[PDB]
Each structure stands twice: as structure tokens, then as C-alpha cells.
RNA sequence: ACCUUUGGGUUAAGUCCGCGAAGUAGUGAGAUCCCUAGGAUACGAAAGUUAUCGACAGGUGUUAAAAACACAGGAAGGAAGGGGCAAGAACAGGUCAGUGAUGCCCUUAGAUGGUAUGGGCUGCACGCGCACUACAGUGGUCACAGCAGAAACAAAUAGAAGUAAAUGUGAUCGAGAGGGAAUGAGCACUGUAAUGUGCACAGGAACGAGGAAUUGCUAGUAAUCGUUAUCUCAUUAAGAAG
């Protein structure tokens, strides 16, 4: 069987799954579109950001497919970025020596912890006597 | 061969006790025994104003009734199904059966 | 797509060899943190000086989501500033980033007016501003000048951003933000 | 292979539109020049050939549906795909469907040309309609 | 006075002489220096970018930016 | 406000006088000892007791 | 009850029958107190908001959150 | 005209003014013996550098 | 008759630390649930689900005690966040139009009790409270894509309830081409009945950012944007509750 790992990344109500695999060539697909065809540039910027703090020689000989559901356009890009980030570390730990995993992890942790850990942040429930989570309806006197 | 037994109940402690009792029965017979599957609880809810008239600050309450449930899927012969069904009575838990 | 090198702002701008050029401001202006896109969700606002660690152009786009109707439209703000950097980089000839830095340096008022009198009537007096408040006011004025200028004028908003920022960096009377910095300092002196 | 995803939608929809018109495979509804696409729209389309852009985009919906192996597409599904937000004076805007008559006519035109086959629970492609698309893409990417 | 819906010959002639030595130029400049409407500043600007007299440097959504003969970019 | 409350400080004070030699500078030892000796019905309480007891033991 | 009404066609000679649909307050009276207002119709209850709150704990509803 | 003196804050003392907006501070000038008492209104940390318009005007109450 | 004694520090809280003619136990707080976030070694061969675990001001730094910040690691850090429950005493506070809960007074076949057909509650000189669309270009219009909380959708040749919308790309329009109020001859739907709702063609009012005053809101908060297989509901949401 071909060398593979699977990871999950979360932001708000968006969930994404990344599968990572051995390849003769570096390849990346999101929503079945390559980076040079995909229609939202915020997603493409957030991908090429994380791909540059990780060295290009660490993403060599490797393939990625990203799938996602839930949330919305900004939140899914961060969800995807975590799923991508965790795949490389997972693969290095499983299929190479563990020093290279540790090295890569120091670089990502120096850049942005939120690439490898998920924010527990969610919308707060509405209470009665106001339009939203904390705002109150207008009191009057005279 | 197969049976699926649904224990359905609007009280958690009862369903926990009765399932532990039935799990013990399964492991004492030892037919390759297993835990029950914990089901998604059904939740029916109502939201209403507290005051019986319009006066005061409008204060609201949400009442919700929770119907817990647990499923056993199990392997038995027809005699053991017929004989064990004597266990399935005098409970506040409602009990239902499926077979193939 | 465009590059396989090191991290540059909008994938275009150098992100190195940057000087603050006022020692009173040094610790409070983040031009360290290499980010491809002026967007982060980093949860620093729930901290004691965490809003001083947010990167510079980030603070600058947040300032645009205003006038009520544009609340929450952070993508729109990024679209706007991207274009402004193209106009400025062209016009000035230097990293748009050093224009933005120098705009802040000039546009913060150094002395201010305040009520001091406690045990009686409240009498106004001059007072001296902290480093942090000085930069907070600079962004505010630069933003307020831009917004009100564009309201019912045919010119494009990204163009108005380039007009103001150049002038501000160059300390010219032409900037709304610079003029109003002079006014506050003159009134402060009047009440000295 | 899922050949359709290899080219950008805003190059494919305009490309097929010419191949349609030069062979007249679909014929305009009566009064196409003054009718609106929905009750949610403010004015009739700015391009006189809007009917052909509909035909080109309908075959795209079907190609990707076939690619992902979904259930067949219904007249209701297409009506919600092309829907929009209707203006209502002094009231919030509200989501409204596209008009069915245009879509029905396109699907019946494509049936007569042998391009679309009616199933018991929706509409589906046919070999000729797949091969036209295949042979277009093979030039268009090169 | 209101704006205009023609570029007459003598306005056309002097615009060619004026567009050289200008740096970045945009729809507004033609419409706020000279008296042209936005609908005739687009058409003239698009014409000069086919004639190689100006060059386009951005066109993102409807926001569209051009450069003349004394533009010069940054260098690494 | 992170103040311990009356029963938590009382049980803390009694246990250190009753079992002193059994206790150490370590939170986990002290948590093991209060899990062993006490009737306390929630981990929420015994986390707070062993917190105060290891705060006393230094002083 | 589903009541029925006669109606005449345009000839004022031929007759047909039509059924009155049961709708509105008239048949949805509170099962505890005959009230016509504030009746909770959900889960096939037919009980007013006043009566509900005194009986809710007997039926088996609780305020968890 | 742009006269200015740069001074280093050594201590902070009291939250002051209506609503507690100001902070009483001790400042030493960088190129002179002078040490002053002043009110400052932004957030201030010890070891900050502040720019003064006068080296003399003082808040004697300290 | 009454007081338990010198009122010094801390917390959300007589919550606590000192000292005492006082000392010992309890209620209230607190602790004690439930939901939301992380966690298989358990279960399944389907690819998820659930979980007795995890955080204590613990660590470092702040030189009586009690607490505290500021950093740091951490899915979570000072009451982890949000709800829910919740002393004693009071008030001539509200409801007799919720109640086969109820005292006392009043009416009771020409009824102050029921029913039916109609009319009103919806009238219009005028003063007030709370909401909805606005006053444009950070806009209008045309097409095309495309994403929620998750999963339900006969048919329809102009058009006559439904699976987001903001939003993303290209065109277009150009400073009352913004705005849709009063009104005409129609074309359909719900209904026992249109007076209610939908659709097409017109028509095109004020309003160009609001005096004295005044109302909430500390983070996934405020404001924006849609949506309700939530409640009202034959048909009717510009209301609440999510
Ligand atoms: Zn009732």
C-alpha cells in the first residue's frame, strides 16, 4: 500500500479533512481545483504563506487533497490551513526520522501556533430581553 | 440469529440501571457480550412567558423533555429470545424489538 | 503561483531593513511579524498590551471598517489597501511600508489638553501623552481624514489613500491629519 | 477521468456558447428580448444572447453532477441554483427562484437533439453531449 | 458648467502632449482636469492603451490604473 | 475572587495536623493522599484542598 | 364536526354541496380551562400558557438551561 | 518652532483627575541634571521616553 | 426594655485574614446540574459516536497574613465561558378578562345567558411610546459562479410560496437611472364569504443624515447579512424566540 496519513482542522463551524500521500511530484488540490485555478485568493494566500515557513524541500515528493464543509469563506481558509499544516508534521513523524518533525514544528510554532492548534472560539447564545448575546432592548422613563 | 432491542426512556438513571442489568445478563450467558449503543436523545421543547398578565419585565422560560435511548444488537437462538423476553416487563422504560 | 521565495507583503513588498526613526515609539510598532496577508485572528485583545503586538498594516485595515454600514467587511478593506500600496509604491518609489511608518510618526500630537482640578472646579491644563496613546491618535486622524474626503467626490477611494499618506510622511500642510495635529498642539500651548 | 475540472468556468461557458449559436441547437423563447429571468430581477439581461449562456451553463451543471456521481438533476434543483435576492420595498430582501419556462424549453430542445435524456427522477447526459465537451477542452487548454 | 460627451480635435491633440511626463493616471484625472464625463474618459483611456501611448498596470474588478512615459518602478 | 471557603480551609488544616509525615512538597503526592484518606465526593473540591495543603506545606 | 353548506350555480337552479373547513379559535379551546387565548398547539398539546406551567412537572418537562 | 526635550520616566505615583484619566510621574531629562514632576495622560510604563515642550513647567503637588 | 462590643487589610459574597468577654455548631453564598469546547485503551466495519479524564492562582516574579496582576506554557488560566437554581423580612405593587381557585354585592326569558346574519374593534382634527425602509457610488443594473447552521422540495412556455443572503469575477449606469408613498383598467390564489395575499403595466410623495433631550454595549461582544421542518398560521410577520 502507498504511504498515507489523514488529518482534521477546525475553525468556527467549518471542518476540513486532508489526505497526504507519496508522489513523484508535488501536487495540491482544493475543491478539485489546483492553486492556479481556484477562485478565491484569500485561500491561495493563506496556503502559500504556510508553504514558505515550511521549506520547499520538505513538501517535495508529496501530494494533497483537501475537502471541507460548514462555516463560511474566511473561516474555511483557516480550517484548511490547519489541516494542511498538521499533515506534514504527521508524515515526517511516521515515515522519516523524528528530528526533522521537531525542526519543522519549531518553525511553524515560531510563526503561528494557530496553524497547529485549533481556536476554541464559537458564537455565544442569544438570551431573552435583547437582540443578541449581550445587547439589551431600550429602557425608557418618560 | 440477530436481534435489535431498543430501550427507550425519559429518565436517565433507570435506563442506566436496566441496561447495566441486561449487560450483566449478556456477559453471564457469555455469547460474546458487548455494551449498548448510546442514541441521540430526542428533545422536545416549549418557550413561554412567566407572568399570567402583561405586567413587569417580560421574563421567559424554556422547558425541555429528554427521551434517552439505548440499543443492543445481539446474537441469540429463537428459544433464548422467547425465554429472555420474560426480562422485558414491569419497567418504566418502553421496550421494542426488531428481527430478520 | 507568482513566487517560491521568502514572505513578502501582498507577495510583492520586501519586508526587511525597516527603521522606526523615533526612539519614543520603538517598542510599540510591530514591523517584525512576517505575514503574507494582512489578516490574523490571534486573540490578543484579551490582554494588557496585546493590541500593541498586532502588525501595522493590520491595525491600518481595521480602521477602514467604519461609518456603520461597513462593519465586519474586512475583505473589502484588504482590497482597498492593496490598491493604495500599488499607487504609493509607484508615486513615492520607496517600500509603501516606510511611507506608512513615517505617516504615523508625524501625525501623533505630543502635548494635549486635560482637566486636572480635583478638589474644586475642573480647570483645563496642558498634559503630556504616552507613547501608546500617541500612535492610537495617529491612526484615528489618518482614517478620519480619508473617510470624510471621499464622501461625495468623484475620485476613487484607493487614490485618496495615496494622496494623504504621502503628504503625511512628508509632514506637509496638505494632510488633514497633519493640520489637526498642529491645532491640538497649539490649543495645548494656549492652556499651558 | 473528471476532465471538466481542468479549465476555468469563465473561459468554458463563453466557449461553448459560440458552438451552440453557430449550430442553432437551442432556439429562443418567444419574447426573449424583453422577458426577465426571474421575478427577483430588476431588468431584462444586458446580453441579447443570454438564452445561450443559460444553455452553456446548464450543460456545465450536468457535467459536474456526472463527474461527482450525484442523483439526476430536477427542474426544481436548477430553479434554486439560478435564484437570487428579490427587492421588496420597505421590507427585508428575500430569496426567490428562477423562472421554470426558460429551463423547460432548453431541456426539451436538448432532448430533440439527443443531448439530454429524461429519467424517472430527473435529467441526465448522453454520449454526444459528453464528447462535444471532451473535444472542446482538448483544444482549449492547449 | 456641466461635463462633455466629445473629445474634440484640439482637446485630443493636447491630451497626447500632456499624457507623457505624468506617472500614474486614472479615469478621474481626464474628467477633473479636462471637462470629459466618466463615460468618455473610459473610452479615450482604453484607446491610448491600444496605441501603446500609455500602459495598464492594474485592472481588478472595475478599479483600473494606468501609467505614462515617466513612470519608473522600485528595484531589488 | 479565588478564596477557598470555610470547609476547604478547615479540612486542609485538620489533614496536615492528622497525617503530617505522609505529605510532601508535591501536588500529585498530596492529591493521592487526599484521594486515599478523605470522603470528598467531587474532584472539584479535592483539587482545591490539595492546592491549599501544598500552599501550607512550604510555609 | 365537519359542517356542510348548499350553494347554487350561476343558473340559480342547479345545487351543489361544499364542506366548511375547521380553522380558527373555535375548536382549539384549552383542555384544562376552555380558554381561547395563549393555547400551545405544539406536540399535540392543546393547553394554555397559564395551565402549562402548573402541570409541566407532572407531564415531565424541566428547565435544564 | 520645534524645540523639544527628551525625558525618561523613573516612577509613577497616582491616578489623578476627574474620572482618574491622568498619572503623576517622575521624569529625568536625558542631557541635563533636571528631574521634574509631571502629569501624563496615556498609558505609561516605567523606562518610557517622552517628548516635552518645556523643561520647567511643573506639577509641584508630586 | 437592650448590647456582645475599638469598625485594621481582602472578595462577586461577614468571602476571608488579624484582634478580642466571648466561644461552638448551621441556613443564605458557596459548594452542589445541565448544555457548549478537548480526550479511546471502549464500540463498529464503517469512516462516526460516546467518554470517572483534563485547570489548581499550579509555575516564575512580586519580602506579615488573606487575595492579586503580569507573563508562560496549554484544547481550556484566575468565579474556564454561557445559562439554570436561588435567604429572612417586605409592599394595603399586578392580575377576580387564565382557572369547576374564591368571600361579598349586582343581573337573571322583553337576560348582563347562548346562537345566527350583518356592522364595529381597523373611524380621524390632533399629542406620545416602540419598530421597518431610506436618504446612494464603501452605490443601482445584467450575467455567471459559490459557501451555513446541515440534510424533506407534484408538475408549470410571461408571471402568478420555498434549500441562504451578504459575498466572488466580469459587464453595464453616472450624481434624485437613490427612493417606492397615495392611485388606474386589469390577470390569478386562499376562503363559506375578500375587505386579505401574489403578479403584470403604469403612476411616481416626503426624505439630501435629524432641536432640547435620551437608550444599550468589554470579544466571536457590538453592529451588518440572510434563514427559520420555531411560535402565532385557511390565507395573512415589518412581532417575539432561536
Ligand atoms: Zn388553560
CSV table of N, CA and C in Angstrom, one decimal, chain E residues 18-72:
chain,number,residue,atom,x,y,z
E,18,UNK,N,0.2,65.9,-23.1
E,18,UNK,CA,0.1,66.1,-21.6
E,18,UNK,C,0.2,64.7,-20.9
E,19,UNK,N,-0.1,63.6,-21.6
E,19,UNK,CA,-0.1,62.3,-21.0
E,19,UNK,C,1.3,61.7,-20.8
E,20,UNK,N,2.2,62.1,-21.7
E,20,UNK,CA,3.7,62.0,-21.5
E,20,UNK,C,4.1,62.9,-20.3
E,21,UNK,N,5.1,62.4,-19.5
E,21,UNK,CA,5.5,63.0,-18.2
E,21,UNK,C,4.4,63.2,-17.2
E,22,UNK,N,3.7,62.1,-16.8
E,22,UNK,CA,2.6,62.2,-15.8
E,22,UNK,C,2.6,61.2,-14.7
E,23,UNK,N,3.3,60.0,-14.8
E,23,UNK,CA,3.2,58.9,-13.8
E,23,UNK,C,1.8,58.3,-13.9
E,24,UNK,N,1.3,57.8,-12.7
E,24,UNK,CA,0.0,57.1,-12.7
E,24,UNK,C,-1.1,58.1,-13.1
E,25,UNK,N,-2.0,57.6,-14.0
E,25,UNK,CA,-3.1,58.4,-14.4
E,25,UNK,C,-4.3,57.4,-14.4
E,26,UNK,N,-5.5,58.0,-14.2
E,26,UNK,CA,-6.7,57.3,-13.9
E,26,UNK,C,-7.9,58.0,-14.5
E,27,UNK,N,-9.1,57.3,-14.5
E,27,UNK,CA,-10.3,57.8,-15.1
E,27,UNK,C,-10.7,59.2,-14.6
E,28,UNK,N,-10.4,59.5,-13.3
E,28,UNK,CA,-10.8,60.8,-12.7
E,28,UNK,C,-10.0,61.9,-13.3
E,29,UNK,N,-8.7,61.8,-13.5
E,29,UNK,CA,-7.8,62.9,-14.0
E,29,UNK,C,-8.3,63.5,-15.3
E,30,UNK,N,-8.6,62.7,-16.3
E,30,UNK,CA,-9.1,63.2,-17.5
E,30,UNK,C,-10.5,63.9,-17.4
E,31,UNK,N,-11.2,63.6,-16.3
E,31,UNK,CA,-12.6,64.0,-16.1
E,31,UNK,C,-12.6,65.2,-15.1
E,32,UNK,N,-11.5,65.5,-14.4
E,32,UNK,CA,-11.4,66.6,-13.4
E,32,UNK,C,-10.4,67.7,-13.8
E,33,UNK,N,-9.5,67.3,-14.7
E,33,UNK,CA,-8.6,68.3,-15.3
E,33,UNK,C,-9.4,68.9,-16.5
E,34,UNK,N,-9.6,68.1,-17.6
E,34,UNK,CA,-10.5,68.5,-18.6
E,34,UNK,C,-11.9,68.1,-18.3
E,35,UNK,N,-12.9,68.5,-19.2
E,35,UNK,CA,-14.3,68.6,-18.8
E,35,UNK,C,-15.0,67.3,-19.2
E,36,UNK,N,-14.3,66.2,-19.5
E,36,UNK,CA,-15.0,65.0,-20.0
E,36,UNK,C,-15.8,64.2,-19.0
E,37,UNK,N,-16.9,63.6,-19.3
E,37,UNK,CA,-17.7,62.7,-18.5
E,37,UNK,C,-17.0,61.3,-18.3
E,38,UNK,N,-17.4,60.6,-17.2
E,38,UNK,CA,-16.7,59.3,-16.9
E,38,UNK,C,-16.9,58.3,-18.1
E,39,UNK,N,-18.0,58.4,-18.8
E,39,UNK,CA,-18.4,57.5,-20.0
E,39,UNK,C,-17.5,57.8,-21.2
E,40,UNK,N,-16.8,58.9,-21.2
E,40,UNK,CA,-15.9,59.3,-22.3
E,40,UNK,C,-14.4,59.4,-21.9
E,41,UNK,N,-14.2,59.2,-20.6
E,41,UNK,CA,-12.8,59.1,-20.0
E,41,UNK,C,-12.4,57.7,-20.1
E,42,UNK,N,-13.3,56.7,-20.0
E,42,UNK,CA,-13.1,55.3,-20.2
E,42,UNK,C,-12.6,55.0,-21.6
E,43,UNK,N,-13.4,55.6,-22.6
E,43,UNK,CA,-13.2,55.2,-24.0
E,43,UNK,C,-11.9,55.8,-24.5
E,44,UNK,N,-11.6,57.0,-24.2
E,44,UNK,CA,-10.3,57.6,-24.6
E,44,UNK,C,-9.1,56.9,-23.9
E,45,UNK,N,-9.2,56.6,-22.6
E,45,UNK,CA,-8.1,55.9,-21.9
E,45,UNK,C,-7.9,54.5,-22.5
E,46,UNK,N,-8.9,53.7,-22.7
E,46,UNK,CA,-8.8,52.4,-23.4
E,46,UNK,C,-8.2,52.6,-24.8
E,47,UNK,N,-8.5,53.6,-25.5
E,47,UNK,CA,-7.9,53.8,-26.8
E,47,UNK,C,-6.4,54.0,-26.7
E,48,UNK,N,-5.9,54.9,-25.8
E,48,UNK,CA,-4.5,55.2,-25.7
E,48,UNK,C,-3.7,54.0,-25.2
E,49,UNK,N,-4.3,53.0,-24.5
E,49,UNK,CA,-3.7,51.8,-24.1
E,49,UNK,C,-3.6,50.7,-25.2
E,50,UNK,N,-4.3,50.9,-26.3
E,50,UNK,CA,-4.2,50.1,-27.5
E,50,UNK,C,-3.1,50.7,-28.4
E,51,UNK,N,-2.9,52.0,-28.3
E,51,UNK,CA,-1.9,52.7,-29.2
E,51,UNK,C,-0.5,52.7,-28.7
E,52,UNK,N,-0.3,52.1,-27.5
E,52,UNK,CA,1.0,51.9,-26.8
E,52,UNK,C,1.5,53.3,-26.2
E,53,UNK,N,0.6,54.3,-26.2
E,53,UNK,CA,1.0,55.6,-25.7
E,53,UNK,C,1.0,55.6,-24.1
E,54,UNK,N,0.0,54.8,-23.5
E,54,UNK,CA,0.0,54.5,-22.1
E,54,UNK,C,0.1,53.0,-21.9
E,55,UNK,N,0.3,52.6,-20.7
E,55,UNK,CA,0.3,51.1,-20.3
E,55,UNK,C,-0.6,50.9,-19.1
E,56,UNK,N,-1.3,49.8,-19.1
E,56,UNK,CA,-2.2,49.4,-18.0
E,56,UNK,C,-1.3,48.7,-16.9
E,57,UNK,N,-1.5,49.1,-15.6
E,57,UNK,CA,-0.8,48.5,-14.5
E,57,UNK,C,-1.6,47.8,-13.5
E,58,UNK,N,-3.0,48.0,-13.5
E,58,UNK,CA,-3.9,47.2,-12.8
E,58,UNK,C,-5.3,47.2,-13.4
E,59,UNK,N,-6.1,46.2,-13.2
E,59,UNK,CA,-7.5,46.1,-13.6
E,59,UNK,C,-8.2,45.0,-12.8
E,60,UNK,N,-8.4,45.4,-11.5
E,60,UNK,CA,-9.0,44.5,-10.6
E,60,UNK,C,-10.5,44.9,-10.3
E,61,UNK,N,-11.4,44.0,-10.5
E,61,UNK,CA,-12.8,44.4,-10.7
E,61,UNK,C,-12.9,45.6,-11.7
E,62,UNK,N,-13.6,46.7,-11.3
E,62,UNK,CA,-13.7,47.9,-12.2
E,62,UNK,C,-12.6,48.9,-11.9
E,63,UNK,N,-11.9,48.8,-10.8
E,63,UNK,CA,-10.8,49.7,-10.5
E,63,UNK,C,-9.6,49.4,-11.4
E,64,UNK,N,-9.2,50.5,-12.2
E,64,UNK,CA,-8.4,50.3,-13.3
E,64,UNK,C,-7.4,51.5,-13.4
E,65,UNK,N,-6.1,51.2,-13.5
E,65,UNK,CA,-5.0,52.2,-13.2
E,65,UNK,C,-4.0,52.1,-14.4
E,66,UNK,N,-3.4,53.3,-14.8
E,66,UNK,CA,-2.6,53.3,-16.0
E,66,UNK,C,-1.3,54.1,-15.7
E,67,UNK,N,-0.3,54.0,-16.6
E,67,UNK,CA,1.0,54.7,-16.4
E,67,UNK,C,1.4,55.4,-17.7
E,68,UNK,N,2.1,56.5,-17.6
E,68,UNK,CA,2.6,57.3,-18.7
E,68,UNK,C,4.2,57.3,-18.8
E,69,UNK,N,4.8,58.1,-19.7
E,69,UNK,CA,6.1,57.9,-20.2
E,69,UNK,C,7.2,58.1,-19.1
E,70,UNK,N,6.9,58.8,-17.9
E,70,UNK,CA,7.9,59.0,-16.9
E,70,UNK,C,7.6,58.2,-15.6
E,71,UNK,N,6.9,57.1,-15.7
E,71,UNK,CA,6.8,56.1,-14.7
E,71,UNK,C,8.1,55.3,-14.6
E,72,UNK,N,8.5,54.9,-13.3
E,72,UNK,CA,9.6,54.0,-13.1
E,72,UNK,C,9.4,53.3,-11.8
